[PDB]
Structure formats: C-alpha cells, structure tokens
DNA sequence: TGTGCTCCGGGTCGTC
DNA sequence: GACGACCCGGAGCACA
DNA sequence: TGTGCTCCGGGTCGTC
DNA sequence: GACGACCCGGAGCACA
C-alpha cells in the first residue's frame, strides 16, 4: 500500500516496500529552518524484491521540490542487517528511535516525521451583496480554485488528515503570536514548524515570514485544499443581525442627514452616497450595556473593508496588552467620532473598490475628560469619569442636535470651537473614546459609496 | 581487461567495462593540494551487462584510501546517453575533453588523470665494509623490504611504467628545488604534483612537505617498489678509486701521526683510532689541478657519514647561488682545516654509530689572504691572491712540518699564535678556504673510530 | 574601426 | 562530492 | 559521600 | 547530504 519511491529506477514495479505486522518500513522526513535557509526532506524505504528474498534500503534526500541524491544499499538475504541500516539512518536524522516512533518528538536541528497518505438564498438581496463584500467571496473563490490547480501544493505527496491537523496547530501557533502582534523571534520558532510539518517548494528562495493576515488566509485555503448556502452560514458565524432599511424610513432620513451634515469641510477630496443602510443587533450586547450612564451618543466608527468581519464577529475590541501604542493618542481603547468623514477616512478605499462601511453606535460616554493635548495614559486620568473626549477645532453644535431611540445624534453643520493647543498638535475634530466594550451598542451599519474629486 | 570496480556490488562479475576500438571507458583521476588539505580521487566507468545490452555509468570518489560515495546511473539501451554522462563528468572534473585525452593537461584545482596497470665480491674486504657504510646498505635493504610489504603503497591500484616515469619527473622537480634549497612556496607547487601523480593514503592527516634528503630516498625506494654485485656497481658510479693501505706503509705512518698530533687540545671529549686508510683518485681531478700555485698543503675535511656519497661522486662542491650564507664565515667555498679534530667535529657521529670519515686533500693555496675577523664577501678581497686563511689562536708550527708527495703536511703539536681579534669572535684554529675545486685534489680518505670520554 | 543586445557557458557560491 | 542559483564576461550579431 | 580511570557515544567539525 | 577525526563529558567502575 506504500509505493516504492518512483525515483528508484532499479526497483520500481519489480519490488515492494517490505512490511512486518503493523510496522511499515517507509518514511518521509522534513525539516525547514528559515534561520539557516534550510528546507530539506529525507526519504527512507526498505525494499524486498517481489521475485526473491533480496533486500535493500533506499534513501532519497535533498531540498523540497528537487529530487537530489540517492543511495541504494544492497543487503542480499541479511534482512537483519537492512533493519539496522534503516533504523540507523532514522535515528541519525530524527534522534527518535524507530521502535518508539509512535511517540515522536521533533528535535531542533533534526528532522520532523510526516504521516503520508498512501492511497438557495435565505437572505435579502441587500444583505447578500453585503456578505459578498465582507468575506471577499469573488476572491476566496478564484483563489480556492488556484489552489485546486497548484501542483507544487504537495511536493512530498498527499498528506494524511492527521498530518494536516498538525498543520492547523502550527498555523494557529502563528495566528496567535500575530493576533498578539509579537514578531520578537517567536514568529520564526512557529513558522519553521508549519513549513516543517507542511512541506513547501520555495525552490532555493529563502522561505518567507508569514506576517500579514492575508497570508494566513492563503494557508487556510491551502490546508483546506488538502482535505446551508455558503453566504447564509457565513452570516451565522458573525452572530450579528443585519437588516435592510427603507430609504424613506425615519432612520435612513436621519442617518443620511447625519452622514452628510457631519462630513467635515477639510475632508474635501470626496463625498459620500449612502448606498444602503443596515441595522445592527449583536448577541449579549444589549444585556451588557451600561445604560445607566448619561451623555449617550450615536457616534461613527470606520475601518478598512478588510476588517469588518472581525468587528461584527467579536465586536469592537481594544488593542491587546502588547500595546502597539503609536497612533492611539489617548491609550488603548475604542475610538469614535462625531464627524462621518473623520471615520470614513479610516476605511481606506480606492477609486476601483470605492465602497466602505461605517458603524454608527450608541456610546455611553458618562462624564467626559476633555483634553487639548494627547496622553496615552489617559485611561488612568479619569479619576472616576467614564470616557475621554479629545477636543477639536470644529464640532457640531448642540443647537442642531436630535435624539434617536434615546441616543443623542450630533447633527452638523460643524462650527469653530476656538480650541487651540499651545503646546503641540491641535486636533481637527473631536475624538470620543471609551475603554470598555460594555459602553458600546453597535446600532447601525452604513454601506457607503465614495466619490473622488481628483480624476487620477 | 579493465576490471569492473569491485566496489560496485551490483555489476561485479555480472557485467564488463564497455569498450569501443582502442578507446576504453575506464578512468582513475586524482588530485592532491596540500594548501587546502585536498587528497581526492575520482573513478568513472561505463558498464555493459554481459547478458543484455543494458548500459550504466559508475562513479566512485572520495579521499585516497577511503571508499567514499558512489553513484550508479542506469541508461538502459541508450548507449548514446551513457557516453554523454561519462564524458560529461570527465569534462567536469578534468577540464580536458574525453576525445583529446591523449593530450591531457592537468588544470590547477582540477583532477589529474592516471594510467592504471590493469593486469661475488670483486673488491677488497676493506673497501666492501666501506661502501656498506657509505650507502647505508643494511638500511636500504630493511627499508626496501618494508616497501615490498606495505599495502597502502598503491591505494588506487597498480600503476603503469609510464605513470611511474611521471612519478620520477615530479619527484625530481622536488629534488631540484631542494638541491637548490628554495622552500619559497615552489616546494608546494612540485610536491602536490608528485602526490597527485602518485597516490598516497594519509588518512585525513594533512600530507607532508618533503624536505629532508632522506625522505627523497624513501620515495625512490617506493617508486622502485612499483617497478655486477650491488656493492661493486655502487663503487662504479662514484667514478672514484679507493684503495686500502698497509698499516705500516710510510703513508699510514705519517697520516696517523698527522691525525693524532693535530687533534686539538680543546676538542678533549674524544680521541680517534684510524681503523683503515684509503687512497683517493678521482677522474679528471689530476688533469684539472692548478699545480702551478705554491703553498700546497695536505689538509683535512670532515662531514657527516650521511654525505660522503655525494662528495666522492661529484667532488667537493660549493654552496649553490641560493646562498645560505649563515655559517660560511668567509663566503661560499670549500673549507679545510690543519687540525684533524676541527674537521672530525663536522662528522657528527654518535656513540652507537661511532665511525666517521675524514678527507685529506692536496689544496693549492697560493698566497693566503689572512684575516682575524670574518667577511662573507672575502672571495672578492683576494685582489689577485688565490686563497683565504682565517687565523686561529692555535696552529701547527713550521718547525714540525713534513712533505708527502709534494704537499706540505702541517704536523702537530699545535702552539699558541698570539692572534687575537679585538672586534669580535677570535677563531680557535686556522680555517683554509679556496673558491675553486680546481685547487683541490682529494688524495686520502681516512676511516676513523671515535672514542668518547663521557659515558652517557 | 564600435555599441547594443541577447545567448551561452564557465566560476563561484550556496544548500544537501 | 552532487546539484542548482547567481554573477558576469565573451561570442556572435544587428544596427548605424 | 569521592577520585582515577577507561570506554562509549554524541556533537561538532573537516573533507568529498 | 556522506563519512571520518576529533573533542569531551558522562556512565560505569576499581580503589582507597
């Protein structure tokens, strides 16, 4: 059932992989160490000629994807010898005995072992063109196909379900220290294990450090390429409810007016056209809200089209303790604006793909700690207060405000606030921030079309 | 006729070295570079199975003496391919095409090619115990035997007469730059060629630089170990005549008296016993002598037992132009003493082998340039004179002199000369020197037994 | 007479 | 040692 | 309780 | 990668 390595031109078809009980003498090793530009494989087999009892040990090895060098060792009838040679080479390169291979343990600077495999829409059309954008469906398809027709996928052979399961472990090992964000040399420790357990053909090019979140996807599709309408069960996992809204309903009228009237004058390189409007209701958020706090406002939050999945799936999160505190003017937290164009800027859309989303959201502010200058330790300066508000040269005025289901909507136009920071950078526009997702109820999700002034 | 490499376990006996016309597909390469500790060999063969027309190219290689690694390449019936592989590898490592191998040329950093071989005394008993000492017969025998029973002699196989002929070329290449004396990195250039053309098993120990004259002999015996009583035809090559002399003949009486009376008082750690006395008559020396010069003296010259062959064979030579002028107080030349123990010191004999020789010799001095201090440029200071005499604190006095066949014998005892060098080293004893072998007639050859005062 | 340009092929180096 | 990559100069050539 | 001592066996390195 | 050498520490042991 385990084939004689087709590269052994001397015993192909004319012999078979000797086997004894539940113990098969055939193995594929593999080791990849980005540090040393190592990406090696080592194959061993124990052969019995079909016709006679002639024995021999076959050894192939080289870089993954190349066929490398070989060694054919003739043992004649001394099988006892062949099993020494086989197990000797196996101990040499694995540092694991052949008899306790069931309990294998990869040694750094030695080879891992590898188990080889020898063998209707239930949603409104508006929500469907939404999930299609949130999950990049046209991409995950044209790329899922590109895997199905990639030969270099399995350069050592079809892997086993178990083997790939280990692929997800070491892939998630990377996922976790990147969802932590630490590239502090633990990215090497973990990536080497994924390339090791999951062979890759890089030719001789040094293998990459898998950092971006996109690269993480390609692998998922890869691993899947080795193993309830789709759109409808994507929606389910979000555990969030998104409902179209009528373009004349009271909410659309007011959320439009808010989006337009609060588009800042200094963000004059584009306008916005509210293509569609969606309600937002996430599990456990109503239960968890701190509705006792006053100064509740419906406020904007924008982000790259690329990231709206995670926001709806696990909610609006805060930076991890790894503390990449560079642009977080007021410390790790959940930022909101009372100008639409302020948050639309963080959608980072392009002329070609010119439709980002915006998250209106009820924010229990409480009493605001109002600050001209920025202080990344601001969460500590509350001294009992419940939010922080960076002050801007411009803001909507209370004269023009309105209320929608108990939250204050700060309709434009914006107006000069006379706020100036003598010591340093003065903010253009307010920036509200809370440090606890319990002060956040995701209430509306705009889908916006961007219109650029420049032509190129 | 060329055997299938016994190390090819898969085709031994069951196949033969394919051959076409006068062109045989079998080769032994070899390269040794002391600089890089390289001592490698490379074997290629082209095989045809006896039974079928199946073809294959066999390649063995590694360090000389080890069996190394191998590559067996199966070509099936595509002989046209096999000859490519064979000739490809051959071009790869020789940088010489296989078709013009007859005109082979070793490239530095590439492999040389190797042609493998696939297949009563006529003298007085006193002169015989003399040649026995001059040629180290007991040694050249017990060592000639040690070669006959040295297996590591030919680690790559029996060489051909032609191959060994090249061994003598590269051996003499060393002989000449050591008979020149230059170790100025040309010893490497030449030695590498001898080890290359003549394989050696050093294990992994870095091969030696062959410097001493003894090492040169071992090789001669080696090369001979790969390819008219002996004593009587040794004598012949010297082209010098050595005749016993009676222990009561007038010469023995006077040469004794000279040897004893002129043994210096400060050389008091030994005495001498004239075992035998031999006349000396060398071809062309009488004809060439400058007998017109006055102040002819019979003077001593001693030297290591090891070197008496060369002195009698080519005469008394002078240092080559390479000018190792370190102990040559008065410039390159032929030195003599008028004290026996002065020259007996340069025999460098040991308690165990305690019999050196001494060369009495007629020396046409002419007018002497007499010098307290030494001047290695003294040959230039003659200004017409024909010899130089370093002055000693002690010398035989003319009162006690005698003449023997027209040369002045300066019989002892020696006496203080009151000679003192204010500026530097004062010589203990006279040191006569001439710069032309035509002022030298080798007349007598003493054989002396040394007797040590110390016991250990 | 040279200047581009590609294509081959060796030399060195890097990985196994 | 076995390959494969990589760098790089020279052969041959089109073109002006 | 440790101190010699040899013998084995891995780790590293060097040559092909 | 394949070997072989070489270095070196630890296991086992005799001995006091």
Author numbering:
A (entry chain A), B (entry chain A): 91 to 209, 231 to 338, 355 to 583
Show the paper's wording.
Human PARP2/ARTD2 is an ADP-ribosyltransferase which, when activated by 5′-phosphorylated DNA ends, catalyses poly-ADP-ribosylation of itself, other proteins and DNA. In the nucleus, the main enzymes carrying out poly-ADP-ribosylation are poly(ADP-ribose) polymerase 1 (PARP1) and PARP2. These enzymes bind to the damaged DNA and subsequently generate poly-ADP-ribose (PAR) chains that act as recruitment signals for a range of DNA repair factors. The WGR domain of PARP2 has been shown to be key to DNA damage recognition.
We determined a PARP2 crystal structure consisting of the WGR domain and catalytic fragment (PARP2WGR-RD-ART; residues 90-583) in complex with an activating double-stranded oligonucleotide mimicking a damaged DNA. The structure was obtained by using a multicrystal approach where 26 small datasets were merged in order to achieve a complete dataset at 2.8 Å resolution. The asymmetric unit contains one PARP2WGR-RD-ART molecule with one dsDNA (DNA-1), while the biological unit has an apparent 2:2 stoichiometry in solution. The complex is formed by two dsDNA oligonucleotides joined together at the phosphorylated ends by two flanking proteins. The WGR domain detects the phosphorylated DNA end coordinated by Trp151, Lys130, Lys183 and Tyr201. Tyr201 (Phe638 in PARP1) forms a hydrogen bond with the phosphate, whereas Arg153 and Asn127 (Gly565 in PARP1) interact with the N-1 nucleotide from the 3′ end and bridge the connection to Gly314 of the RD domain. Interestingly, in addition to binding to the phosphorylated DNA break by the WGR domains, the crystal symmetry showed that the catalytic site was also in contact with the DNA, namely the unphosphorylated end, where the last A-T base pair is opened up. The 3′-adenosine ribose interacts with the helix lining the active site and its ribose makes only one hydrogen bond to Asp396, while the 5′-thymine binds to the active site and locates in the nicotinamide binding site between two tyrosine side chains. Upon DNA binding, helix α5, covering the active site in the inactive conformation, is divided into two parts at Gly338, and the helices are completely reorganized. Subsequently, the catalytic transferase domain moves ~11 Å away from the DNA and it is rotated and translated implying mobility in solution.
